[PDB]
């Protein structure tokens, strides 16, 4: 139970802007002494979970996030064949070495430039008959003709190492190298992958989230319509480690029926359901058979949902109430409030959530499946909720005649596309993960907690007026 | 009675920004299962009522809103002959087929272009000896000389159908048509009207608001000065289905006298009176003989009325108090707070109002009586409270000498003209009605209410601080 | 005592933005039935008092405000000879006819143009041997050479009338006149003054504030330093009807001594003292012998005083407390909070103040003593707290050596000059008085009060959160 | 204990924007009757203390602030030799005459121009064989060739006086001088220093803060890592009058150990420790042996610390609680909230703090160690937290291998450089000190306190809503 300062008993619900953490006595000497592992059974070693948004949940996203201890949920409308392919690709990745962008010496320079932005490494490795022959950077290919080929651009001077060497040794090798990328190769000499100098440190900081067979974890979502049981069984057979039953309004008859149908199969996977913002809804979802309840409905005071309907709840009070209700029954809750700062993750963990769902914030990253765009000032940006609308209408395309599609489409708003600018200092999602984990670790050291359960047990909170925001 | 979360007992009055709806358990599968019909005796099938503003309350407005289940109140100062003409025109319209813009082949192309914007259809039908001969669109007439005529512009290729055919068939016919407008014709072959492809769906979604004789409903307002009884009797004889006695300050001796005078005639129509913001005023207006009390005085914290006088009340608390007071006596209340988002309509219905009055928001539509204007960036806009001031001074023109007109005009502010921009995606008022009804239906599904009485009975509300708006 | 809605008991002090008036039952048919006369013994017929600011308190200001029922306080540092001259000039004015700008036919056209802006009439009357010979307008003199004279510009076609004729007749005469100014002349035929067509109505609306001898009233301020008794006696002998002892911090030993010294003389005039924001200070000032207590210290949350020192109080709570304390002893209070909207005057009167002090708001008027300036966009503006600083340092100039002047001047901020733009529709102060009185009368009709005592006795107030300002 | 108005019991923590001071009865005739001396044993005569920030804590800063009664804390990472040199330089300065910028006649004019901005005097004195030969101003050197020398620019007409003359006489001598700088010289005729005409008044207003030997006071900071005892002993031997043990999070085991280690040496100096925001932390720090507790953690609602971690406390409530806790044990507290207006200093003193720490606000001054920069509009500005980052990484440079430096540097944000513009009217820090002391003295006169203890004993405070900030 979250403790509050004496006399702090507001007559209203609290947002993240209404509360602050009071520093306690702390024995935690450094941020590295803090263990961020979660206990909700999701197997993540960091509290960050990536939302099942088409503009965010890519295969590159899944690999990169799972390697650092997070987990990514695949969108519900992805075809089962694509789901199986993505799961196999993710579970075939290495736990330490990142999968690089690779190029044959015959591809156009323009295609190489376009593919260069698909990863945070900033350099591609040219491959010939399965062997690496040179590196190519942005500045190298940028100064050549539009119709030039890769062959006469790559430079053969690059650092290389066998797989399995100590990442500290890779860091030492790259100290004076002109390029921050070392190529790791199998003992057969075939291309195995690349390590960035920062990646060697990250491999020591972050523990990968792996299943019982030592492969990277991944999750998949299901809709509340159709044969939910068959879809859940198919996804479980495809190798998904966790299932999310997602709808805009949990705590309705269809969700209870879907949760019962999925639980009857006894797949043995953790089952996530949401969203709800009340203790009664959390109790109903847990009794129906869900193990984890996803929390959050119309969180913002000026969000689309609340401006359309007036329905919602401030995130902090909802998370507190739902976490208390779930812990009463031995369940766990996920915060799905639309995190935008590390403060939100820290406060959600303090309120009692076991994990935090991050959505459009990760859209503005290289590893997101969307293509890179440039503004008038050539600043890189990506469109959140852009082409993904097609997938939504795909769920309508399988439905009835165009008459019913237009009838259902009458009471629907236009696409809420958003310009997510990429941070030049934090273009890669690993930088955002570093930012968030740094904030959480600092919060734990301020409270004096060695782990998240201690953070929830020992935190003290106070309430501030709006006048401090003037 | 509206229920509030435990401990939510503020020491102040609440606006729409101070409250939110908490989702309950819901059996409502879809938004189409929700019945939006009102019980206040006004006969509307949607809670939307259009305010008696000269810049909004047109005959096109009345027809279009009444066809979709709303109702429009005519301004108080309209002459009785114009009132009778408008009532006859509205009650001669068809319940399904919309009245199109029509042109003879001899009118100038410029006049056709000017008239094209008077409806949301975007195309006019050329008529000769009562028969349709072709369609004309914006792009067709835009590419021709300023002095060209309609004759040599119209194209004879258009879809046509007899009146009374299934709107689904009209939708099917228009699927591959180059123009989204089908011409419906009487069996005699004379022009009967047009259906837009969206109109065919809307005719299945919305039930028209009709009187006992099956004609579209309309209402008219009366002032509190002069012979109120004679004016009310004249308007009732003209065929108005509902009477609104309107003044800026209800709960005064003149309003009580006027309500008594109108009720003494026993016209049998519902009688609306306002505005008041207190339970005592609602009780007085109901006891005087009013059936419906219109609520709202200086709603906004920075409105003209409150900046001039400091008089007003936040809309939510006023609506709650007045609705409780009226339901104690078996009356009903209308919310006249100046709706700007569907959230306001939903919250007004939750507070206990039976209907909602919408004013200047509908000014920026094609069907509004004002003429279209274009900004420097050629964006379409209309002037709210523009030429309508003349009508106001018309009430002064019938009065005393210019000396008294200037004396009374000394303590009066200038005209509060406003630039209401037209939404390119929602240029027609039917799009705004779709927006509002979508918001209300979503609110009902979130609460789990099949109808508005259930919405008022089952809603749960919470209070938020201002800090969430930072 | 101000009544509040049930449960409205805030744990903080209230500003004007925190409160609203709730409309009561009202028998007041029209705004003209409301009597705005004050009972504090100041003799004003409207609650407006003009602050003793050098940039505002001019002789034109005093005449124009006193004619409409207000009163103006002369600055404390004005020399006694100038005070006597201004008092004689004000008390020699006519109660109905305004003193016009007059020109001899030999003055330069440029000087005529410069003097034209000194009054709201917009036209000057050329005088020769004490007789009027023609009118001159802005547009007439604007189209002529920079060195032209008045003689060959004036037009002899103007409306004229004897003094004492009914203002309604003057209104009738001016109805079709090309110029809105009628020249009133004594029976000897000498120039007596002018009436603007609006002035004829204002003369029927507003009752002038006159002393026992039927001359216009005026007040003068004294400082708390030096021989306060001698200065007060000199000002009383000069004919000032009311004395204001003013300092930035009332409720200090020097103020008590000064009030005792002035009261010992038994001049028989009302005595104003301030400022204080506490009941204890009001009691002390009244017991010392003051009849009226001026209320307000650092009213704004971001004013200079509060940003410098953190000292102040919200205006509404201070006025309520001080008015209650003063009425306990039979005194009265003046609100000196820096009015900027008519809402502030209405709320100050509702809280219990008998009069309201208006300062820099009136600076942006023609009748203010400052000269007209024009921005880059040629918009007219005036500098509040501009040259007046000299007068302040004049109080330092009479003091000690330049060493002490610099020593005292070390702990002083720079001049807080402000750009007060003139409203094109309200360039004259009479328009601002009309605005304020219209707001107050509307408030009285909403409450249902025929006079200010009834307004204080019957008003009901509520409290709103800050969320309504989002 | 701070007293609050009746009924003011908020359910939240208060910032400086939430509270105001209510004027009491006051016998303090003038601001000069107020004694600003502190009782915390730091020996300052004004409550201003300068933070140990590299961008602020310079030797010029230390001299100028100590001469006016303040004190400056040297950064923790400054080498001990530089600390000793700075302490000797500060303790060799004169108590009245300021150390001028001096130039030999052979230096380039460009170097003279660059050095001219290092002091607020605005003029340099050319020295030859230890004797003054002329003055040089900005305008003089600005109109000459880029390669010109000082020799042929200096003007020999300057005012001179022997050291020890009455500052009033120096003021009199400078009254009609063309240059506001008088050169004070030893009886041997060698250059001793300069007095600005304002400095002569300031020398009478401000009493210098001096140790038992009559030399200017200075303080030095220590880190919580390494051998804290050895560093403290070295700094005490170097002549530092006060020691500050500083870390971002006080109330942790390492701080308790460091305080115990420093107190065991029994150096006899006052010991400052922070930061904490709770009474428990203050009690722990005092019991460990600290004499003064520095208060403030994440003060702003949108500061970097709170946006990263959600950890902090509003400054007012924290200062009140910590001051009460410390006075219970006979300690004192310093407010380290990031002062930006004199209101903050006054409110911190009212809450119960004995001194106030001022940081980046003083960065935008001539005496700050940073170099002057000019914006596009040639406005002078300085970079707060610019090159100082190097010093931080210097603490990392002495550490482990580059691997550990990068590992620790992963969880660190970029430099928070800020553009601190220099006020043209307040370019020198003495002007800012005058501003702050004027605000504090005005607060004391409003409360009616002759000294800071009376200010804390007699102040009355009220609480305001956020609505006043609209």
- Does residue A17 share a domain with residue A136? no
Claim to verify: residue B11 and residue B159 sit in the same structural domain? no
Beta pairing, strands A123-128 & A131-137: antiparallel
Mutation target to probe the B interface, by most B beta carbons within 10 A, among C350, C465, C466 is: C465
Integer CA distances (angstroms), C309 to C302, C408, D33, D314, D348, in order: 11, 18, 17, 19, 11
- How far is the C-alpha of B300 from the C-alpha of B286, rounded, in Å? 26
In 3D, which of D452, D450, D444, D433 has the Cα closest to residue D206? D433
Backbone dihedral region of A294: left (phi > 0), alpha (psi from -120 to 50 degrees) or beta? beta
Interatomic CA distance for residues A202 and A223, integer angstroms: 36
CA distance A97 to A201: 12
For C53, residues 6+ apart whose C-beta sits below 8 A from its C-beta are C75, C359, C360, C363, C384, C385, C388
Helices A253-264 and A228-237 cross at an angle (nearest 10°) of 40
Could you give the residue ranges of the DSSP H alpha helices within C196-314? 197-205, 228-237, 253-264, 279-288, 304-309
Q: Is residue B353 part of a domain?
A: yes
For D23, which of C297, C407, C413 is closest by C-beta distance?
C297
Q: Based on the domain organization, do D366 and D266 belong to the same domain?
A: yes
Phi, psi of B134 (to 5 degrees): 175, 165
Of C384, C411, C379, C385, which is closest to residue C396 (Cα–Cα)?
Answer: C411
CATH code, domain with A35: 3.20.20.70
End-of-domain residue from the set A205, A227, A252: A205
C15 and C58 in a single domain? The answer is: yes
C95 to each of C168, C207, C217, D89, how far by Cα in Å? 16, 9, 11, 76
Residues of D in contact with A436 (CB under 8 A): none
Does residue D14 sit at the A interface (CB-CB below 8 Å)? yes
Q: Could you give the CA distance from residue B234 to residue B218 in angstroms, rounded to a whole number?
A: 15
Q: CB-CB: which of C11, C26, C341 is closest to B307?
A: C341
Q: Which of A12, A253, A300 sits opposite B463 (nearest CB)?
A: A12
Q: Which residues share a beta bridge with D381?
A: D373, D421
Euclidean distance between CA atoms D38 and C100, whole angstroms: 63
Q: Which of A205, A238, A253 is the last residue of a domain?
A: A205
Q: Which helix (H) or strand (E) holds C349?
A: helix C342-351
Q: Is residue B12 part of a domain?
A: yes
- Strands D355-358 and A48-50 come out as unpaired
Q: How far apart are the first and last CA of chain D?
A: 31
Of C23, C28, C466, the CB nearest to B278: C23
User: C229 and C345: one domain?
Assistant: yes
**Cβ atoms of residues D332 and D292 within 8 Å:** yes
A contact residues 251-280, partner B, Cβ 8 Å cutoff: 251-254, 276-278, 280
Cβ count near B286 (within 10 Å): 22
**Helix (DSSP H) and strand (DSSP E) numbers for chain B:** 16, 20
Q: Confirm if B199 and B174 have CB atoms less than 8 A apart.
A: no
* C219 in a structural domain: yes
Side-by-side strand order, sheet with D460-463? D3-4, D460-463, D19-21
Residue C304 lies in a domain: no
Q: Which chains touch C (3 or more CB pairs under 8 A)?
A: B, D
Determine whether the interchain pair C11/D16 forms a contact, defined as Cβ–Cβ distance below 8 Å.
Answer: no
B224 DSSP 8-state letter:
S
DSSP code at position B384: E
**Using CA atoms, how far apart are residues A314 and A352, in angstroms rounded to an integer?**
15
CB distance B418 to B388 below 8 Å: no
Q: How many domains does chain B have?
A: 2
What secondary structure does DSSP assign to D356-417, as a single string? Answer: EEE-GGGGSSTTSSSPPEE-TT--EEEEETSTHHHHHHHHHHTSS-HHHHHHHHHT-PPP--
- Technique employed here was cryo-EM
Closest CA to A153 of A163, A165, A138: A138
- Burial state string for A120-132 with b = 16 or more CB within 10 A and e = fewer than 16: bbbbbbbbeeeeb
Question: Coil, strand or helix: which one is D450?
Answer: coil
Residue B426, classified by CB atoms within 10 Å of its CB into exposed (0-12), middle (13-18) or buried (19+), is middle
Q: Is position A51 annotated in a ligand binding site?
A: no
Contact yes or no for B295/B322 (Cβ under 8 A): yes
Annotated catalytic residue: which of D141, D303, D322, D444?
D303
A296 is in an annotated binding site: yes
Q: Does A347 contact D252 at a Cβ distance shorter than 8 Å? A: no
Question: Is residue D80 domain-shared with residue D194, that is, in the same domain?
Answer: no
Q: Is the residue at C42 inside a domain? A: yes
The rounded distance, in Å, linking the Cα atoms of D18 and D343 is 12
Which resolution, in Å, applies to this structure?
Answer: 2.8
Same domain (yes/no): D332, D412: yes
Beta bridge partners of C451: C35
In a domain, B203, yes or no: no
CA angle A70, A74, A76 (to 5 degrees): 145
Q: Are residues A90 and A115 in the same domain?
A: no
Of A335, A349, A355, A315, give the one whose Cα is nearest residue A442: A349
Residues B140 and B218 in one domain: no
Q: Which of residues 297-336 of B touch C (CB under 8 A)?
A: 297-298, 300-302, 306-314
Judging contacts by C-beta atoms under 8 Å, the chain A residues touching residue D281 are 23, 25
B66 and B131 in a single domain? The answer is no
User: Residue B463 domain-assigned?
Assistant: yes
- Residue A406 C-alpha from the chain's centroid: 34
Nearest residue of B to residue C430 by CA position? B410
Same domain, yes or no: D197 and D219: no
B-interface mutation test, from A14, A307, A311, most B Cβ less than 10 A away: A311
Q: Which of D213, D198, D210 is nearest to D429 (CA)?
A: D198
Q: Which domain does D9 fall in, by range?
A: 3-94+208-469
- Provide, as residue numbers in chain D, all residues whose Cβ is less than 8 Å from the Cβ of C403: 168, 171-172, 201
A315-328 and A279-288 helices, crossing angle to 10°: 40
Helix (H, G, I), strand (E, B) or coil at C45: coil
CATH number of domain containing C171 = 3.10.580.10
Closest CA to B355 of B50, B13, B74, B60: B50
Environment class of residue A67 by beta-carbon count within 10 Å: exposed (0-12), middle (13-18) or buried (19+)?
A: buried
Please say which residue of B167, B196, B225 terminates a domain.
B196
- Cα angle A24, A28, A33 (rounded to 5 degrees) comes to 140
In this structure, the answer to whether residues B250 and B171 fall within a common structural domain is no
Is the CB of residue D3 less than 8 Å away from at least one CB of chain C? no
| Interface contact C444, partner D, CB < 8 A | no
Rg of the Cα atoms in chain A:
23
How many CB pairs below 8 Å do chains C and D form together? Answer: 147
Active-site residue set of B: 303
Chain D: list its partners (3+ Cβ pairs within 8 Å): A, C
Which residues of C342-408 form beta strands (DSSP E)? 355-358, 373-374, 380-384
Please check whether residue C248 lies inside any domain of the structure. no
Catalytic sites of A, residue numbers: 303
């Amino acid at each position: 139970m979250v403790r509050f300062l004496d006399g702090h008993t507001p007559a209203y619900d609290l947002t993240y802007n209404d509360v602050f953490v009071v520093p306690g006595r702390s024995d935690v000497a450094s941020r590295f002494d803090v263990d961020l592992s979660t206990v909700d059974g999701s197997g993540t070693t960091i509290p960050v979970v990536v939302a099942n948004m088409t503009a965010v949940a890519g295969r590159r996203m899944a690999e990169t996030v799972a390697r650092r201890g997070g987990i990514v949920v695949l969108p519900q409308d992805l075809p089962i064949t694509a789901v199986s392919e993505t799961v196999d690709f993710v579970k075939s990745r290495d736990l330490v070495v990142d999968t690089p962008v690779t190029l044959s010496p015959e591809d156009s320079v323009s295609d190489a430039n376009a593919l260069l932005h698909k990863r945070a490494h900033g350099a591609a490795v040219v491959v010939f008959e399965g062997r690496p022959i040179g590196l190519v950077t942005e500045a190298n290919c940028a100064g050549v003709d539009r119709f030039a080929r890769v062959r006469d651009i790559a430079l053969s001077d690059f650092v290389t190492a066998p797989v399995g060497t100590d990442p500290r040794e890779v860091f030492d090798l790259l100290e004076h190298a002109p390029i921050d990328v070392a190529v790791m190769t199998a003992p057969d000499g075939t291309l195995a992958g690349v390590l960035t100098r920062t990646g060697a440190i990250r491999a020591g900081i972050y523990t990968p989230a792996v299943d019982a067979k030592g492969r990277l974890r991944i999750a998949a979502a299901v809709g509340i319509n159709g044969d939910v049981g068959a879809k859940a069984q198919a996804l479980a057979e495809a190798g998904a480690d966790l299932l999310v039953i997602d709808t805009a309004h949990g705590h309705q008859a269809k969700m209870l029926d879907a949760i019962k149908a999925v639980a009857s199969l006894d797949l043995g996977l953790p089952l996530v359901a949401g969203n709800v913002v009340s203790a009664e809804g959390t109790r109903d979802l847990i009794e129906a058979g869900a193990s984890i309840v996803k929390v959050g409905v119309g969180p913002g005071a000026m969000c689309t949902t609340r401006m359309m309907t007036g329905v919602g709840r401030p995130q902090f009070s909802a998370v507190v109430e739902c976490a208390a209700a779930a812990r009463q029954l031995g369940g766990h809750v996920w915060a799905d409030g639309g995190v935008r700062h590390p403060r939100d993750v820290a406060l959600a963990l303090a309120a009692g959530a076991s994990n935090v769902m991050i959505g459009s914030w990760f859209a503005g990253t290289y590893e997101s499946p969307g293509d890179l765009l440039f503004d008038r000032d050539d600043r890189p940006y990506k469109e959140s909720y852009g082409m993904a609308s097609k997938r939504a209408v795909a769920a309508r395309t399988a439905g009835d005649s165009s008459f019913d599609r237009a009838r259902k489409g009458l009471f629907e708003e236009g696409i809420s596309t958003s310009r997510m600018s990429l941070d030049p200092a934090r273009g890669g999602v690993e930088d955002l993960l570093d930012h968030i984990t740094s904030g959480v670790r600092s919060t734990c050291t301020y409270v004096g907690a060695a782990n998240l359960p201690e953070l929830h047990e020992k935190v003290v909170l106070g309430v501030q007026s709006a006048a401090g925001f003037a």
